[PDB]
Amino acid sequence: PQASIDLTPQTFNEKVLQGKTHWVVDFYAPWCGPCQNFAPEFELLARMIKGKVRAGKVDCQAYPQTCQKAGIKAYPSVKLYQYERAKKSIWEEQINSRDAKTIAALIYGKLETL
């Protein structure tokens, strides 16, 4: 059962960027061998970090301006959007890994640090 949610320009803006919670987002395209290989890894990642971090996916073929605005130039790309409560703001970082265990460790470290 799918642990990540499929985001649209509207829900990515509303739930992630204007949100009060942490997200990892997989920016992908459907015609993409690498994206296809990574999809079940991203689901594993979503299941690993559930309840600390939400997981979303953005189809960059369907929504090219959203992906362009997020600085995405190749697929797949994973970004962490973390909420800093005291500053009421979302901080983003691209995580250059295709491995769920690796990405989870990196996310958890980033969440520990101011």
Swiss-Prot record:
Interacts with HSPA5 (via its J domain). Interacts with EDEM1. It comes from Mus musculus. The chain holds residues 669 to 782 of 793 of the full protein. Disulfide bonds join 32-35. Ubiquitous. Particularly abundant in secretory tissues. Ubiquitous in fetal tissues and tumor tissues. Higher expression in fetal tissues than in adult tissues. Expressed in testis, pancreas, fetal thymus and fetal kidney. High expression in heart, liver, kidney, and testis. Low expression in spleen and skeletal muscle. It comes from the Eukaryota. This is DnaJ homolog subfamily C member 10. It is found in: Endoplasmic reticulum lumen. Disruption phenotype: Mice are viable and healthy but show enhanced endoplasmic reticulum stress response in the salivary gland. The gene is Dnajc10. Residues 3-108 form the Thioredoxin domain. Endoplasmic reticulum disulfide reductase involved both in the correct folding of proteins and degradation of misfolded proteins. Required for efficient folding of proteins in the endoplasmic reticulum by catalyzing the removal of non-native disulfide bonds formed during the folding of proteins, such as LDLR. Also involved in endoplasmic reticulum-associated degradation (ERAD) by reducing incorrect disulfide bonds in misfolded glycoproteins recognized by EDEM1. Thioredoxin domains 3 and 4 are the primary reductase domains.
